[PDB]
From a paper:
Each subunit has a modular three-layer design with an amino terminal domain (ATD), ligand binding domain (LBD), and transmembrane domain (TMD) which forms part of a common pore. GluK4 and GluK5 cannot form functional channels on their own and are obliged to co-assemble with GluK1, GluK2, or GluK3. Here, we report structures of the GluK2/GluK5 heteromer (GluK2/K5), proposed to be the major KAR in the brain, in resting (apo), antagonist-bound (6-cyano-7-nitroquinoxaline-2,3-dione [CNQX]), and agonist-bound (L-Glu) desensitized states.
We next pursued a desensitized structure of GluK2/K5em to understand how the receptor may reorganize to close the channel in response to the sustained presence of L-Glu. Purified receptor was incubated with 1 mM L-Glu, imaged by cryo-EM, and the structure was solved by single particle analysis with no symmetry applied. The data was processed using a similar approach to that used for the antagonist-bound dataset, and we first resolved the full-length L-Glu-bound receptor to 5.8 Å, then independently resolved the ATD layer (3.8 Å) and LBD-TMD assembly (4.3 Å). The most striking feature of the GluK2/K5em-L-Glu structure is the LBD layer, which shows rupture of both LBD dimer pairs and exhibits an apparent fourfold symmetric subunit arrangement. Although the LBD layer gives the impression of fourfold symmetry, close inspection shows that the G helices of all four LBDs come together in a staggered arrangement to render the layer twofold symmetric. Furthermore, close inspection shows GluK5em G helices reside ~3 Å closer to each other across the twofold symmetry plane of the LBD layer, compared to analogous GluK2 subunits in the homomer. The analysis showed that relative to the CNQX-bound structure, the L-Glu-bound GluK5em LBDs (A/C positions) are turned in plane by ~18°, while the GluK2em LBDs (B/D positions) are rotated by ~110°. Meanwhile, for GluK2em (B/D) subunits, the M3-S2 linkers extend ~12 Å further from the membrane in the desensitized state. The desensitized GluK2/K5 structure helps rationalize this functional role for GluK2, suggesting that it is the GluK2 subunits which undergo large conformational changes to facilitate channel closure during desensitization.
Numbering used by the authors:
A (entry chain D): 33 to 397
B (entry chain C): 21 to 399
C (entry chain B): 200 to 248
The structure:
């Protein structure tokens, strides 16, 4: 009876007609509708636009269009500038924004009607700090893709001033996937322990280049922040003895998790990555997984809140949404035990910093 | 066409501010006052006060600005959030954005780039701090960042050091804004040089708290990076023992600097003399200088071509027809002015720029020499 | 020290694992070159290269 619509502002993907995040959003609304336990009297409709990459004026135009149609949330996008643009439209217009990938937050920016769902890189880097001490590393080298600033590693850079750690930061060649001069510098320096901080599509390349450069021996120990580490394929190097140790948020032990992962994969929804890259098939990556959780955590808050409906909202001529404060609070106080563990929010900034990680590591199997 | 009208954006207030409204006006008064033959197209500078550093407000302002058919959009001075939205809108519309503040966004190079930044680039100040530390024989420094955007501003400085207690360690100000525990750690680890980085007011707070924790003496060298350093005036923090050093780009010797500082001296007390006027803060000059930049390039294009402005609506994608041409002409312009030489590289940044270092004295400045942009550190 | 290749296969992973365990670092391989390529791929993915 009740219709309620969400908006999505997703990227243009040359991987196909639907991006992984977009496919998940489309798959999510359908899955949350066909469940009967949740949103029983209502339903979801979803207006998903695309943008080009790095298009903040077009993204703000899109958000004005969707909010002029009448939405109750605006999900996506992923790239930081378009993310921040939609955030500001939404914060003034009162409609809750539920990002998915980690954006860089400006520390002035007083905006509150946003909730993030990537586990925030302050606390995640603090986890990497607790890992470096467990392996008793004294020297570590952090290699970061330039697209992401060192700001998401700010706890790793504040970390040498409070322990004895001889950090050294190097930049992955961003324009290229071929980091051989960097890797040769890393080896001539005998920098045995490295904390790579890059998307896993970069991480498959870096590990492959490493094997060629013979840095994949039983000496090196490479910690990775990329929460898709399990979806990387490791059979070229499993017997080498390189002690890779990364983090992993997906609850692949649980059976509802593993069957949802199976549904998403065996429905051919994803686009098959080729075996040149050394990446794998059939995996719901973290990005998409958080999104499947995101539609739910918002829909849980919807189900808790019966009387809000959408309303058409013009940009710059209309007031804050009349239900924004109420809906936003309910989104921030939702405990939903989703695919990526529990979802709950540090109520100060609407971020997410409570989450139960699983360290994974490379055993010989 | 008949008036090269351009659009200010001032995040600054009209009362006791950096006075940017007054400086942009002074520059306008000086140019439309310098009578040349033939009687040219006038210069009008339209000014738009922006309340907050919210991208949403800026999109409203730029949609209120594009109809005015303006050659460029100066500023916004100190709003690093709003800067990416202006730059994005005008890189969409093919109209140059002459940025006058820094950029603390990551600023992907693949991003649509048609922006010329009269403000020293973040890599370039980083290299200046690197090369002042190479003059001081690489002491075990410790960097005091105000926000976390310090780390994106001083990025190359950080990478070029083995981060530890023994070469360079980062501390950052907490949410309490009380630096005294940090200076107590710095005094603990025998840390000789402190590289304070903030806006000018948090700079005074770190120094005053430091002067009281008795950490302003003969041993400590403080390489402040806050490039507003001419307006910082310290009482009870500056001794002849004390070695605070900032950078400042003002070419005081340029003839207009004395008169401009007189004009910005007059319109400071009238709005308020509640504090004494600490001198012209940098963004007044960069705006004064930039109006000269854009007028000069537009005037050259107005010669080899003829440029028409079109009522541009943020709705319709109509693009200013001559924009990438003006861009090309902007990237080769050179003006020697209050902010020094103003010449731009292909990337749309500023090069051949002189950061005149200052080491503070008990009253003011001692030019201990220049860190050139290219021939690095001929001090 | 003489070690025989697996005449059962080309999957020399046990033999290479002993070779590494024993810190043997210099190896004179005598095999026809198809077997040489096989052993070198399985030496690479055994972190002996």
């Amino acid at each position: 009876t009740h219709v309620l619509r969400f908006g999505g502002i997703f990227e243009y993907v040359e991987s196909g007609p639907m991006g992984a995040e977009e496919l998940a959003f489309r798959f999510a609304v359908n899955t949350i509708n066909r469940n009967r336990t949740l949103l029983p009297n209502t339903t979801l409709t979803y207006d998903t636009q695309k943008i080009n990459l790095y298009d903040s004026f077009e993204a703000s135009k899109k958000a004005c269009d969707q909010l002029s149609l009448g939405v109750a949330a605006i999900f996506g996008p992923s790239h930081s500038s378009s993310a921040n643009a939609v955030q500001s439209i939404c914060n003034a217009l009162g409609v809750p924004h539920i990002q998915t990938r980690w954006k860089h937050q400006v520390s002035d920016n007083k905006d509150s009607f946003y909730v993030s769902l990537y586990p925030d890189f302050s606390s995640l880097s603090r986890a990497i700090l607790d890992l470096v001490q467990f392996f008793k590393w004294k020297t570590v080298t952090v290699v970061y893709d330039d697209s992401t600033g060192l700001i998401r590693l700010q706890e790793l850079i504040k970390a040498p001033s409070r322990y004895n750690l001889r950090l050294k930061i190097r930049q992955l060649p961003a324009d290229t996937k071929d980091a051989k001069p960097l890797l040769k510098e890393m080896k001539r320096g005998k920098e045995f322990h490295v904390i790579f901080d890059c998307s896993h599509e970069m991480a498959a390349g870096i590990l492959k280049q490493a094997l060629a450069m013979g840095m994949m021996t039983e000496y090196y120990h490479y910690i990775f922040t990329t929460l898709d580490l399990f979806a990387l394929d490791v059979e070229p190097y499993r017997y080498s003895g390189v002690n890779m140790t990364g983090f992993r948020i997906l609850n692949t032990e649980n059976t509802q998790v593993s069957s949802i992962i199976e549904k998403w994969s065996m429905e051919r929804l994803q686009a098959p990555p080729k075996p040149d890259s050394g990446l794998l098939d059939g995996f719901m990556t973290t990005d998409a997984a958080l999104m499947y959780d995101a539609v739910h955590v918002v829909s849980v808050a919807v189900q808790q809140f019966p009387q809000m409906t959408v309303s058409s909202l013009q940009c710059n001529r209309h007031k804050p949404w009349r239900f924004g404060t109420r809906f936003m609070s309910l989104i921030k106080e939702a405990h939903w035990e989703g695919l990526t563990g529990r979802i709950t929010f540090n109520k100060t900034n609407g971020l997410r910093t409570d989450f139960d990680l699983d360290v994974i590591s490379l055993k010989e199997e | 066409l008949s008036s090269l009208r351009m659009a200010a954006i001032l995040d600054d207030q009209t009362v006791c501010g950096r006075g940017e409204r007054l400086a942009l006006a002074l520059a306008r008064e000086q140019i439309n006052g310098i009578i040349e033959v033939p009687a040219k197209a006038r210069v009008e500078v339209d000014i738009f006060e922006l309340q907050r550093d919210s991208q949403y407000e800026t999109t409203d302002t730029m949609c209120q600005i594009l109809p005015k058919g303006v050659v460029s959009v100066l500023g916004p001075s100190s709003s690093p959030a709003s800067a990416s939205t202006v730059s994005h809108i005008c890189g969409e519309k093919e109209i140059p954005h002459i940025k006058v503040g820094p950029e603390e966004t990551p600023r992907l190079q693949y991003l649509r780039f048609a922006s010329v930044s009269l403000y020293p680039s973040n890599e370039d100040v980083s290299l200046a701090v690197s090369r002042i530390l190479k003059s001081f024989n690489y002491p075990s420094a410790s960097l005091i960042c105000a926000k976390a955007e310090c780390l994106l501003r001083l990025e190359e400085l950080v990478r070029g050091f083995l981060i530890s207690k023994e070469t360079l360690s980062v501390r950052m100000l907490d949410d309490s804004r009380d630096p005294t525990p940090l200076l107590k750690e710095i005094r603990d680890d025998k840390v000789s040089t402190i590289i304070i980085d903030a806006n000018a007011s948090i700079s005074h707070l770190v120094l005053r708290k430091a002067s009281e924790l008795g950490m302003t003496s003969a041993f400590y060298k403080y390489i402040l990076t806050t490039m507003d350093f001419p307006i910082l005036h310290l009482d009870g923090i500056v001794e002849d023992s004390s070695n605070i050093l900032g950078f400042s780009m003002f070419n005081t010797s340029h003839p207009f600097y004395p008169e401009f500082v007189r004009s910005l001296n007059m319109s400071w007390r009238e709005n308020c003399e509640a504090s004494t006027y600490p001198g012209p803060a940098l963004s007044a000059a960069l705006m004064f200088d930039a109006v000269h930049v854009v007028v000069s390039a537009v005037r050259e294009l107005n010669r080899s071509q003829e440029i028409g402005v079109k009522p541009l609506a943020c709705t319709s994608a109509n693009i200013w027809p001559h924009g990438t041409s003006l861009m090309n002409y902007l990237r080769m312009v050179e003006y020697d002015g209050l902010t020094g030489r103003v010449e731009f590289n292909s990337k749309g940044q500023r090069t051949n720029y002189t950061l005149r270092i200052l080491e503070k004295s008990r009253q003011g400045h001692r030019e201990i020499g220049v860190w050139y942009s290219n021939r690095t550190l001929a001090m």
